[PDB]
Amino acid sequence: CNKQNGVKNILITFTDCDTQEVIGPISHEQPDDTLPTYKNCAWTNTALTNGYVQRSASNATMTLPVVRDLRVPLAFYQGCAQVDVQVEKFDGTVMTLTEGAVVEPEESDGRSVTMNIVASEIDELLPPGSL
Amino acid sequence: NKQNGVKNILITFTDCDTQEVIGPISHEQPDDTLPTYKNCAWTNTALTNGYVQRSASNATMTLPVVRDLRVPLAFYQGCAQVDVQVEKFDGTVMTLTEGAVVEPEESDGRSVTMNIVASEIDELLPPGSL
Amino acid sequence: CNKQNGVKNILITFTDCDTQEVIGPISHEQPDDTLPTYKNCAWTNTALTNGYVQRSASNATMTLPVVRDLRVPLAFYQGCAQVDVQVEKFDGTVMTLTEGAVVEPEESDGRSVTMNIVASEIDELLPPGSL
Amino acid sequence: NKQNGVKNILITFTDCDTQEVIGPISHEQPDDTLPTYKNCAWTNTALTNGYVQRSASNATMTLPVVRDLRVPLAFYQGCAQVDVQVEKFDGTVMTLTEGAVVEPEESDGRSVTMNIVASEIDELLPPGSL
Amino acid sequence: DALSDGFVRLCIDPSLNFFGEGCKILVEGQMTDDGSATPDAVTCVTSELDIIERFGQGSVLTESLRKVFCTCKSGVSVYALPREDAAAGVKAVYTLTLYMGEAEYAVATDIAAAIVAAISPDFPYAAITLTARNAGTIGNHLSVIYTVTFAQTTAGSVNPTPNDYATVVNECCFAVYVLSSDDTDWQENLRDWIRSAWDCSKPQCFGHGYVFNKGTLGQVLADGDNSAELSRLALPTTYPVLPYLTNAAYGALSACSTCNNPELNIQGQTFGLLSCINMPESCTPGWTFGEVTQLQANGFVVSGPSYTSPYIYNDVTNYLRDEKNRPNATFRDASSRRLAAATGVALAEFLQQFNGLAVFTKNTNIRTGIIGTNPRLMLGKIRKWAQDNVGTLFSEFDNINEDIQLLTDFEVQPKCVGQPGIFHLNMRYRPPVRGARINVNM
Amino acid sequence: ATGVALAEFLQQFNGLAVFTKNTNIRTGIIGTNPRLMLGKIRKWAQDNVGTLFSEFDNINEDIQLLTDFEVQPKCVGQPGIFHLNMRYRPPVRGARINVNMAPAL
Amino acid sequence: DALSDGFVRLCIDPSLNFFGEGCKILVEGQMTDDGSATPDAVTCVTSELDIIE
Amino acid sequence: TTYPVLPYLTNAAYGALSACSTCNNPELNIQGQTFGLLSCINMPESCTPGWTFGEV
């Protein structure tokens, strides 16, 4: 059932920073038609003279808009806790992320929260058939 | 309850000069934009190799309301401390105490947008949690 | 809860040099986004000819930007008292300083004070897992 | 490979009080700034009419790294001897032994900028030289 | 006393192990009737104290425990399994008309009387006529050299074959097994039990046994087999030291060195140095060079001199062949077993998060609000865990998309044969690459 | 737990007007008929997947609702009595993993 | 052992082919009389160790 | 047959632990070192857990 773009499962595990209480992994749902957006390569390049490129260390970011669960405090969605997110797309791809932190908490209306998740590395499950 | 929206907005005004308290007076929503929240009192910042710098910050609230004609307009623009209390339709209650208006805008005299800042904002989390 | 650079708790104990009184330990808070900054090695070095390095006696310094406590006179933050500061980061590290003294006070606006603390040595808790 | 940047950074710590050797350990860059080098062991100075007074100096090295949470912060600020080796993305390798931190600047406890001074730094010059 | 009246309770005592046990070792051997320990019962020996009072004086087990305590100073709890001589056991008898055992045992009628008065009381042979203090073939490995005639008169025979491992030591997991007998049947039985510990049908106590085989080149290989459960230690026919002492020292050194560092190869003049064992200075290192090479090939541990403390090479197990495939060096090195055990326990600990977790199988996907999962997400999480352990547990990889597979029981077993909740994880890891031959050309 | 939860959920029909084979509901009446009861029960069973029941096998067959008239013979049934047959299936949880390792070199 | 009590049941084994057979090949030739294989009968050879016997 | 502890003590501990852990969580299996642990009941150190593999 390929040829379709979208997410099927969104799993988020919250780890408190001061109490160290682990919650999850709870399934979530999209708030709108915008799909989660990813960035795997942990190095940000830059332009130099005559085709040369300078490799500077960076992060594997992931933008993830979800509808907050009513059983979890809103502060957990805005950087007061760690997140171990994992997203499965309709074409079999799975993005696995551990030890992520929300960097820029944008004000949310209390139902939909947009996450800017930053982590060391994001792993792709790459549905069968590779290279 | 699957219905996103606010049901009651209570504001208490404390004049910073005369130390007079007024409220808690119920208020009215001016348009279709809902109040917007930020509870995490820390602002993070992106670093390299997934590290994040946690810097102390403040809890904010963007609350657009319709002014009450029995209250001077200056109270909504930083001349008084505000004790805001907003209850959503799904049972959630946001409680804010000893707030302050940071960036007042040029208001037309009916609808005012309140950029409120407090140390921490409480959440009531309707029954069934964690 | 690791992988997050920041400061969780700051404890300061004031020991007046005139009345020999002791106040604290009182928790404090950051005035802005700058983090407390440390220097542990009690020796400073100097470049010499052909790789050699001159080692001279120095101190373990500390720059602590904090919000003053309204129950404490401002003179205590500006070198009129001795301070025993203790800072715990989010990664578990605890820097302990005893018998300190502010060296170069700066004019403060009455809310935010930046200390320049000096001491013989600063101890690092170095969260579990070492060498 | 038409790419500038470091791939591996190895530092070995030798305490000056207990003669304890730790490492080598791979480290991480703290920001986009790349390590800088001065391999030529002599420093020149300008004189009158083209002449240069040739004088002895050090093979310095400015190494910004992220400290390892298993190593004391004092080891990054001149309390130990550092033996650092670095490899760039183009295959060039700089090797440094018996180096010391010369001007420990007061650091925040995550990112440390080390000013290493050594006798000489050796270069690999990936295949194809002179 | 003042300043201690409440709020604080001092408990000054020098007997407090704040770490707590760690890396238990078991010594198996025979004890004399002079002891007070129950045979065929595992007991904990915790000091260089009485010992003799429990396992007898001069017994092979007593000396093995003494050498183990000599090699190891802290960090291990030592266990012993006493055995009793067989009913038909015949004591070997030697006659003397001086170096014996190890260094600390070293020393017409007037000569004999003074010599006996100086012979160590814990020597395993009764005093000149020397008679074995234990009945069996163990006494046949005594050598006396004057550093005087010594050529033996009686050869011991009949060795115990307990075969009670399941009943005696049922589930007390051990790390290192030391057996102080040359009986091939006993070593094979220990092999069978240790292999039974690595059984897919039962919880596993990953352990390892160290045994010795003394004799000529032709017959020592005939003792060996394809089993990796034991580290066969080849010993030349003219080995001076008592073999069980060397075996116990090697086992104790391996146990204490590894313990919490299950990656270090026991080699080198610094890390594989059996300090307690002492030998007279000599030039011939037992086996010949071709003999040494042949033992190196066929999974036999060779040892050589460095009084000179001995030293071992090729710290490997007796693993040469697969089911029938020749090239298999996976379990050749001794450290590979420790890496396998550590990886297994770490993977078991990591997988613990799926206990009781709702699993949504092939039919559908996870509904919002449920804390369940599906096989694809679990496979991805396991893949990322395997990736994050590169450099400490595994090699980089060959093809992670092909070396890790997760399969539900439904799609493996035939129709209506599979049962829900059970998975099957197939994983081909690779031990990390370490130091090896450099092949320096000058 | 599933039994008591189902008993609690079904309490809305006790005392509710029910229109059997006779005819359909007229305007203004607060009654119901077996088909709508079966639909509501089926949707409730569907909505509890993951906490009480399994995913399902075939929901068109595991849940059936029958009036007492069509079960017992002629003139034997009684009004207001229903027979509900449901084939439960407990949620699937964790169990044996059976890890297989094949090292190399 | 610790935490190896149910659930995870380890089955470590050096020889576990996870692919399974694949692209069979047949070799035909003459043998001496020292072999222990039945003549004119196709058999699967496990490895190189037993070919001589 | 060679069980040291008084059987009713172990039985009561097991029943109490099972009921007491489940209560409002009627899904957790009473098993594993974390959940199937009878803290009150104690035994002397031993290596033979009674039943052997076959009868287990």
Residue numbers in the entry:
A (entry chain C), C (entry chain E): 3 to 133
B (entry chain F), D (entry chain B): 4 to 133
E (entry chain T): 4 to 100, 113 to 122, 132 to 151, 158 to 177, 192 to 350, 358 to 493
F (entry chain U): 393 to 497
G (entry chain j): 4 to 56
H (entry chain U): 281 to 336
Paper text:
In the initial extended (pre-attachment) conformation, virtually all tails in cryo-EM images were bent, complicating the reconstruction procedure. The curved tail structure was reconstructed by dividing the tail into overlapping segments. Fragments with a common curvature were clustered using 3D variability analysis and used for reconstruction with no symmetry imposed. As a result, the surface of the tube displays substantial grooves at the interface of two rings that are not found in straight tubes of other CIS. In the curved tail, these grooves are smaller on the inner surface of the curve when compared to the straight state, showing that these grooves enable the bending. The backbone traces of the tube subunit in the baseplate-proximal straight region and in the curved middle region of the Milano tail structure are virtually identical with an RMSD value between their Cα atoms of ~0.5 Å which is at the level of experimental error. The curvature is therefore realized at the level of side chains, which adopt slightly different conformations in the grooves separating the subunits. The interactions of sheath and tube subunits in straight and curved tail segments are very similar, suggesting that these interactions do not constrain the bending. In the extended tail, these charges are neutralized by the sheath (specifically, by the SHD), and the tube-sheath assembly is flexible. The cryo-EM map shows that each sheath-subunit forms three different disulfide bonds with neighboring subunits, covalently linking all subunits together.
Milano is a contractile tail bacteriophage that infects the pathogenic plant bacterium Agrobacterium tumefaciens, an important tool that is widely used in genetic manipulations of plants. The contractile tail of Agrobacterium tumefaciens bacteriophage Milano is flexible and bent to varying degrees, which sets it apart from other contractile tail-like systems. A contractile sheath and rigid tube assembly is a widespread apparatus used by bacteriophages, tailocins, and the bacterial type VI secretion system to penetrate cell membranes. In this mechanism, contraction of an external sheath powers the motion of an inner tube through the membrane.
